[PDB]
Amino acid sequence: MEIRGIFGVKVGMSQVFTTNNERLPITVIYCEPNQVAGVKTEAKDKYSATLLSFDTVENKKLNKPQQGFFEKNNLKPTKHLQEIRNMTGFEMGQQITPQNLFQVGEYVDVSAISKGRGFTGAIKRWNFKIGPLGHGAGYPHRFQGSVQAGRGGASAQRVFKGKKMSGHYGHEKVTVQNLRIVGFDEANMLVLVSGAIAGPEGGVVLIRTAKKKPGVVKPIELAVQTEKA
């Protein structure tokens, strides 16, 4: 099972009218073509994968150890470096175009770090009912509920690990699946995709083949008409 991937950033949100006569919203993701930093075959490294570099930078940054590492392999000076599992069918330092990997109808998946929300209450995080406000709203009415289930030295006597509670929510690389690719901009090296993409503007996203299916293209056609008078 080979999975082809690419790295990009969410640069905008848009919409379009397509065939079947229905309007669809489109995420705009600038997908930077990448350079093969290395490969790990499943004969010596114990598993198959391909490490890529992206987010290119200048030559005065990228501290001298990593600069010398890049120069040793004649690697493009980049800020970010990530690997994609189960892909070895390429050579060292190859430029990859998403067009050769993704099509106009294939469903894909995106791992993207969500928008950071910092400290969020349990209700804002677990989406439970707010306490009643009639006949006395009570001093607290927006809180966790209750975990009181232990009475006597034999029922609970303590709280269980991993109990739902307020805290840090989001800002994690969530995987969204079955995103129908809408279009490609070869000149500007960008992609337009259906659905929604987590994270803030310019958030780092990794687009790979969906794990719900091996990847089958569908007749996605964009609809345009021209009235004139």
Residue 140 makes CB contacts below 8 A (sequence gap 6+) with 131
Q: Which two tokens stand for residue 93?
A: 């330092």
37-56: which residues touch RNA (CB under 7 A)?
A: 46-47, 49, 51
Distance between CA atoms of residues 193 and 8, nearest Å: 12
- Residue selected from 19, 33, 42, 116 as contacting RNA according to rule CB under 7 A: 116
- Pairing of the two strands 167-170 and 116-120: antiparallel
- Residue selected from 152, 163, 188, 219 as contacting other proteins according to rule CB under 8 A: 188
How many chain residues bind other proteins (CB under 8 A)? 26
Nearer to other proteins, 60 or 161 (CB): 60
- Residue selected from 43, 59, 89, 158 as contacting RNA according to rule CB under 7 A: 158
- Residue selected from 29, 169, 215, 220 as contacting RNA according to rule CB under 7 A: 169
20-79: which residues touch other proteins (CB under 8 A)?
A: 21-23, 28, 30, 56
Q: Which stretch binds RNA (CB under 7 A): 94-102, 129-137, 182-190, 216-224?
A: 129-137
Q: Which two tokens stand for residue 197?
A: 């993409």
Torsion over CA of 147, 172, 169 and 117, rounded to 10 degrees? 170
What's the distance, CA 102 to chain centroid?
16
Name the minimum Å distance from CB 78 to RNA: 11
34 interacts with, out of RNA, other proteins, none, CB within 5 to 8 A per kind: none
The CA distances from residue 129 to 61, 64, 109, 144, in Å, are 51, 55, 33, 10
Distance between CA atoms of residues 91 and 94, nearest Å: 6
How many chain residues bind RNA (CB under 7 A)? 95
* Interface with other proteins, residue 221, by CB under 8 A: no
- State the residue for tokens 């990859």: 96
Positions touching other proteins (CB under 8 A) are: 11-12, 14-17, 21-23, 28, 30, 56, 183, 185, 188, 190, 192, 202, 222-229
